[PDB]
Amino acid sequence: SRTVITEVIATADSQGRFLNSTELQAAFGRFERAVPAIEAARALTKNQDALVKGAVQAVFKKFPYVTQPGEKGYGDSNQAKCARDIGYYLRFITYSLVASGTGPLDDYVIAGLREVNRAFNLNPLWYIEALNYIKGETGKLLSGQSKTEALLYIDHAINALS
């Protein structure tokens, strides 16, 4: 994981000198914006089921064929693991919000995304529409700066999917 302070220690240990003004300043700013990130993560922690089921129904309604027989969206276990995948995306966005760094995201989802989507025939369009729906509900649930910081890690996940 590469969080802001983790970036600080990493970019420091490579060279000789200690943590100068710039690194202390970056850690400082992260330490302010962390607490709003914590409350945003809490607000996002109350609504697992609503977010996941809304996103699932949104991606199903955008793609009518996956539901239809003969397609990989068909199935009880398939839809259950759809829900588990969206829960995974939600929890890893939560982890990123808590850490104030894209470390958990890059570690747990984005690393090896392409190859596995290749081998298991998953389409990133489904997950990208799910993330857009989650963006939509974060628009209403969260307000102001908390909304901004949540949306920034979210659309980072979009940028990773695309």
Q: Which residues bind other proteins (CB under 8 A)?
A: 1, 3, 5-6, 8-20, 24, 27-28, 30-31, 34-35, 38, 41-42, 45, 48, 76-77, 79-81, 83-84, 87, 91, 94-95, 98-100, 103-104, 107-113, 115-116, 119-121, 139, 147-148, 151-152, 155-156, 158-159, 162
d(CA 30, CA 162): 27
Residue 70 interacts with which of other proteins, ligand CYC, a copy of itself, none, CB < 5 to 8 Å by class? none
- Angle (nearest 5°) at CA 61 between 59 and 65: 90
Report the alpha-carbon distance of residue 75 to residue 22 in Å, rounded.
53
Give, to the nearest 10 degrees, the angle between helix 21-45 and helix 4-13: 150
Q: How many CB atoms lie within 10 A of CB 21?
A: 8
18 scored as a contact of ligand CYC (CB under 6 A)? no
The tokens of 101 are what?
């760094």
Would you count residue 159 as binding a copy of itself (CB under 8 A)?
no
Please say which residue, 42 or 64, places its beta carbon nearer to ligand CYC.
Answer: 64
| Residues in touch with a copy of itself (CB under 8 A) | 64-65, 118, 121, 123, 125, 162
